[PDB]
Amino acid sequence: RFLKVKNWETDVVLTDTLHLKSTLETGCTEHICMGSIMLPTKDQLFPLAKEFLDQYYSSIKRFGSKAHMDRLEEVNKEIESTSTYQLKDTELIYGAKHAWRNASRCVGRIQWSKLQVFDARDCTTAHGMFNYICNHVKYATNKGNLRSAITIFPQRTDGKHDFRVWNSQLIRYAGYKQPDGSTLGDPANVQFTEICIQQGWKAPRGRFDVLPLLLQANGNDPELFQIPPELVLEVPIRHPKFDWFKDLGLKWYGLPAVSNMLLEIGGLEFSACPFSGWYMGTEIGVRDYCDNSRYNILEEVAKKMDLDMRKTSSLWKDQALVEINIAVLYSFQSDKVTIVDHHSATESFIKHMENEYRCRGGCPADWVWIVPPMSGSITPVFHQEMLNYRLTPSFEYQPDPWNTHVW
Amino acid sequence: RFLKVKNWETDVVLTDTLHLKSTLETGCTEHICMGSIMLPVRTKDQLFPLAKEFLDQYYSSIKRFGSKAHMDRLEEVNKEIESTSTYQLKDTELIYGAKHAWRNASRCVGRIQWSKLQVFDARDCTTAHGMFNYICNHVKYATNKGNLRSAITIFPQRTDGKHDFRVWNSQLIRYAGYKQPDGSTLGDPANVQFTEICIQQGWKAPRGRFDVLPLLLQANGNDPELFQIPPELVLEVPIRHPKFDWFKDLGLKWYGLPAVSNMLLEIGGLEFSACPFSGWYMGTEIGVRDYCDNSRYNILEEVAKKMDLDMRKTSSLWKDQALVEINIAVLYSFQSDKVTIVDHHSATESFIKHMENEYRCRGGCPADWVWIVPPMSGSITPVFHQEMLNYRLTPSFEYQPDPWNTHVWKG
Numbered sequence: 001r002f003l004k005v006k007n008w009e010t011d012v013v014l015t016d017t018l019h020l021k022s023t024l025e026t027g028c029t030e031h032i033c034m035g036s037i038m039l040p041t042k043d044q045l046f047p048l049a050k051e052f053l054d055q056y057y058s059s060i061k062r063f064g065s066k067a068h069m070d071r072l073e074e075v076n077k078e079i080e081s082t083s084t085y086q087l088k089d090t091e092l093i094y095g096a097k098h099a100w101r102n103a104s105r106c107v108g109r110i111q112w113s114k115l116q117v118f119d120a121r122d123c124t125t126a127h128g129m130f131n132y133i134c135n136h137v138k139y140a141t142n143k144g145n146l147r148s149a150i151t152i153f154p155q156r157t158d159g160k161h162d163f164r165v166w167n168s169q170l171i172r173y174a175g176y177k178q179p180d181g182s183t184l185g186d187p188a189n190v191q192f193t194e195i196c197i198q199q200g201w202k203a204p205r206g207r208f209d210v211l212p213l214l215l216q217a218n219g220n221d222p223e224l225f226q227i228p229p230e231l232v233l234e235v236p237i238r239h240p241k242f243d244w245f246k247d248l249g250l251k252w253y254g255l256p257a258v259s260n261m262l263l264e265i266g267g268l269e270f271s272a273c274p275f276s277g278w279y280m281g282t283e284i285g286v287r288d289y290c291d292n293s294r295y296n297i298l299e300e301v302a303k304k305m306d307l308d309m310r311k312t313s314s315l316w317k318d319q320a321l322v323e324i325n326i327a328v329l330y331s332f333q334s335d336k337v338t339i340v341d342h343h344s345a346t347e348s349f350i351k352h353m354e355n356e357y358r359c360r361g362g363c364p365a366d367w368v369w370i371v372p373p374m375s376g377s378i379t380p381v382f383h384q385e386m387l388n389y390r391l392t393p394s395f396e397y398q399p400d401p402w403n404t405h406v407w
Numbered sequence: 408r409f410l411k412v413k414n415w416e417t418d419v420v421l422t423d424t425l426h427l428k429s430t431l432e433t434g435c436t437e438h439i440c441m442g443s444i445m446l447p448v449r450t451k452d453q454l455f456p457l458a459k460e461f462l463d464q465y466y467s468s469i470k471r472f473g474s475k476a477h478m479d480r481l482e483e484v485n486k487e488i489e490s491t492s493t494y495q496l497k498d499t500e501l502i503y504g505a506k507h508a509w510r511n512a513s514r515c516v517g518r519i520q521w522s523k524l525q526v527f528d529a530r531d532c533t534t535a536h537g538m539f540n541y542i543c544n545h546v547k548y549a550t551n552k553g554n555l556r557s558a559i560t561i562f563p564q565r566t567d568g569k570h571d572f573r574v575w576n577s578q579l580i581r582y583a584g585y586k587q588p589d590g591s592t593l594g595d596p597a598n599v600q601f602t603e604i605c606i607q608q609g610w611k612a613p614r615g616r617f618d619v620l621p622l623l624l625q626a627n628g629n630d631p632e633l634f635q636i637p638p639e640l641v642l643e644v645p646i647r648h649p650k651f652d653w654f655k656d657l658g659l660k661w662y663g664l665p666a667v668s669n670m671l672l673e674i675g676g677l678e679f680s681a682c683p684f685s686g687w688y689m690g691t692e693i694g695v696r697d698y699c700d701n702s703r704y705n706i707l708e709e710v711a712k713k714m715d716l717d718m719r720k721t722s723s724l725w726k727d728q729a730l731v732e733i734n735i736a737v738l739y740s741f742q743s744d745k746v747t748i749v750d751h752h753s754a755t756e757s758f759i760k761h762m763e764n765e766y767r768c769r770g771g772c773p774a775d776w777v778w779i780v781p782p783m784s785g786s787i788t789p790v791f792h793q794e795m796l797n798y799r800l801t802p803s804f805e806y807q808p809d810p811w812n813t814h815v816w817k818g
């Protein structure tokens with residue numbers, strides 16, 4: 001019930017108490033561990049609200065004050081007559097900041113407290129959503145000096161009037177099925193590309209086609225919008241020693257911006273709440289470029305390096321993987337667009353973790369997502385035990401909305 | 408109750424029923440996942456059910472479940488337990504048991520090999536010297552002049568927990584580590600404490616960077632005794648790089664035989680506290696872990712220096728670049744000397760085919776993703792994208808505390 005985590009490279013032991021305030025379920029039992037599964041009324045709403053306001057008022061050093069009790073009352077009365085309630089601004093900011101503080105999969109949480117929150121709760125149409133979004137993108141991009149941010153659309157009401165961003169990320173490249181039967185562009189987005197084309201998008205039918213936004217206001221059918229090209233900062237990818245690298249025609253976008261999650265604060269659900277930070281190199285260089293199911297360019301790169309591709313044991317995939325990632329890092333840096341490498345990101349999180357242990361009594365952390373997808377055991381997170389548990393406020397993953405929306 | 412695992416790369420969906428036969432606890436609950444925690448005298452009473460569970464498993468596997476031969480053996484074990492407190496495994500059962508402990512080892516990527524396992528029965532061994540002989544024979548048989556064969560040697564079972572057989576070495580073959588007065592370390596820093604116990608026990612230590620440790624051997628609850636493995640039995644590979652010629656002058660070598668000797672084998676309720684086993688290396692174990700862990704031989708800097716990488720910012724990926732070359736070197740070296748080795752690409756791929764076979768034939772394959780994914784290049788190996796369920800089946804191998812923490816010195 002008080003739990004220890006050991007770092008096996010340093011012998012630092014941390015004691016976790018924070019887990020006891022754990023509320024949601026993990027998917028694990030004492031019989032089966034699900035650590036590597038990607039997806040494991042007025043009545044219920046008041047405890048949730050209470051649990052949240054309690055932590056808020058504690059955080060502002062006013063637990064059990066006149067102002068604390070007064071708010072519990074007001075919220076309680078609002079639920080009883082309206083069946084929901086509204087967060088104060090200051091509460092909203094705190095909820096969003098803490099949702100990221102609680103995100104057990106996120107290696108970049110050292111920054112959780114620097115999050116600019118944009119209150120789009122007064123939003124009513126897809127056009128409003130687009131406007132808010134363009135502002136988010138421009139503010140966050142900051143000409144390349146990236147700033148973390150989240151934009152929060154109106155909370156779920158009765159589930160029939162949800163605001164949703166249909167894209168999974170604000171900025172993503174189109175994927176298209178080809179005559180030969182292979183894939184042009186990003187295969188991750190085939191399904192969504194076709195929907196866009198089917199909503200009406202004039203697809204340029206290229207390899208790095210920035211997709212249109214699909215915006216749903218008040219549970220209405222969604223509409224398309226192109227993001228002003230001048231707002232989409234992109235980076236052409238070159239190697240600091242391989243001259244031919246640039247001839248591959250590779251580019252990536254500077255702004256990672258998750259747009260499909262559901263944000264839960266004090267029992268209220270914000271179903272459209274797109275957020276953005278900045279890339280860790282490996283997310284582009286390892287996953288976007290190299291995954292079998294993604295742009296998958298290892299064979300092409302390995303050939304240009306004239307490596308021995310006859311046997312897996314020449315470690316040609318590995319050698320090419322490193323060079324691809326040097327190139328991502330080098331390009332972003334050369335163009336002055338913020339990026340971090342896995343070494344410094346993981347070093348940063350270790351410091352963050354130790355901060356959260358002395359300041360908060362722990363830090364939920366999912367080791368399967370925290371350890372980088374290349375060079376695992378030479379980053380310090382590999383040797384660090386982590387406890388994974390669900391705390392609220394949180395971000396949850398949610399069903400791709402076309403399986404869920406009626407047309 | 409059915410459970411599905413998905414492969415995100417292939418979209419193959421597998422159904423696990425096997426987890427229904429799981430008994431030991433994981434350490435996880437519905438409130439907390441312990442999946443990355445390294446570590447998350449028996450009684451007459453609990454024993455016959457454990458025996459019976461095991462023996463029903465054995466008899467189903469040979470297609471004699473319900474046979475007279477099965478019921479006779481149940482009653483026979485029954486009796487033996489009540490009159491003597493324990494029981495003895497037949498040869499056939501011991502072999503089956505040791506194969507299934509490997510089969511159920513959810514952290515092992517090598518399990519495609521599980522049915523090929525040479526079992527050596529050392530249950531007549533009564534002394535340390537006797538243990539040494541048996542271990543020497545194991546090492547010679549498994550080494551096989553470079554053409555490694557999987558094997559395990561099984562020493563007599565625990566009785567009252569006061570007469571335990573133990574190999575104090577954590578692997579049969581490992582290098583010493585010596586802490587210097589100045590805080591540096593010569594040899595393997597993992598093995599420094601154990602090396603101190605050996606020096607203390609009387610070992611004369613050459614004090615260099617790759618000294619093979621002496622076995623420390625405990626028979627029958629007795630104080631352990633020192634023994635030198637015959638050096639002609641210790642196959643070693645000097646490490647060189649196919650393109651870089653300065654690599655060999657780093658002075659590096661490694662032993663060919665990976666052989667775990669500190670674990671506990673449990674079969675039908677019995678505890679074998681001494682069951683050293685051995686297979687062959689996956690190259691990243693030496694390349695990534697042994698050489699490049701910071702707490703081990705820590706050679707990334709020296710290798711990047713000699714490679715003249717830009718070492719002034721981590722974003723050159725100098726560590727990553729040096730790591731690949733070392734790993735190329737280890738696989739090159741083993742292969743040139745005809746010592747069995749598998750790379751991580753080929754080992755993970757075999758494992759996914761093993762894993763799928765197991766779902767079709769057995770109803771599951773428990774697997775610990777945190778351990779199965781190699782410690783480099785994780786995401787370009789197909790295990791990365793594989794969902795896995797982790798659960799504890801017996802027969803099983805178990806960590807046991809280092810013996811020098813528990814032994815009462817007879818003096």
Ligand code: HEM
Nearest residue numbers: 100103105106107108111148149275276277278279280395
């Ligand atoms: C400041 C720079 C940031 C870095 C370097 C970063 C790092 C990452 C990384 C590497 C992942 C794994 C992504 C994957 O492999 O799919 C991740 C996941 C995630 N991060 Fe961050 N993050 C940053 C900012 C943010 C911000 C601003 C938020 C929200 C406010 C956030 C919330 C999340 C969440 C909820 C996940 C899990 C996503 C999922 O489950 O699909 N991160 N983070």
Ligand code: HEM
Nearest residue numbers: 509512514515516517520557558684685686687688689804
């Ligand atoms: C074909 C040769 C084999 C290969 C390539 C292989 C591969 C591996 C690797 C890479 C590990 C992880 C070690 C680490 O990174 O800490 C491992 C763990 C393990 N393997 Fe194997 N294995 C092989 C044969 C065997 C055999 C013969 C057995 C026993 C019969 C066995 C049982 C285990 C156990 C119990 C663990 C976990 C050890 C622990 O918890 O410390 N393996 N396997």
Ligand SMILES: Cc1cc(N)nc(C[C@@H]2CNC[C@@H]2OCCCCOc2cc(F)cc(Cl)c2)c1
Nearest residue numbers: 038039256257258275276277278279280283397
């Ligand atoms: C089925 C499913 C569940 C889930 N939680 N998330 C997904 C999305 C998959 C999981 N990894 C790749 C893909 O996610 C990419 C979007 C997350 C990227 O997250 C960030 C956010 C940042 F701000 C910065 C960085 Cl480097 C990464 C799918």
Ligand SMILES: Cc1cc(N)nc(C[C@@H]2CNC[C@@H]2OCCCCOc2cc(F)cc(Cl)c2)c1
Nearest residue numbers: 445446665666667684685686687688689692806
């Ligand atoms: C605290 C703890 C628990 C535990 N279960 N196991 C350990 C042993 C640790 C895990 N990494 C370093 C040390 O491993 C050496 C033992 C595993 C090696 O196993 C094999 C066996 C083989 F036949 C082949 C290969 Cl590549 C590896 C420590």
Ligand SMILES: C[C@H](O)[C@H](O)[C@H]1CNc2nc(N)[nH]c(=O)c2N1
Nearest residue numbers: 036037038368369791792793794
């Ligand atoms: C099956 C496994 O859970 C899955 O492949 C995970 C592994 N770790 C990950 N780690 C990160 N950061 N992102 C991911 O998408 C994944 N995928």
Ligand SMILES: C[C@H](O)[C@H](O)[C@H]1CNc2nc(N)[nH]c(=O)c2N1
Nearest residue numbers: 382383384385443444445777778
């Ligand atoms: C803390 C963490 O669980 C621990 O470092 C694990 C991570 N994965 C590993 N995987 C293997 N194969 N071997 C190990 O020693 C470890 N160490």
Ligand SMILES: [Zn+2]
Nearest residue numbers: 028033435440
């Ligand atoms: Zn778990």
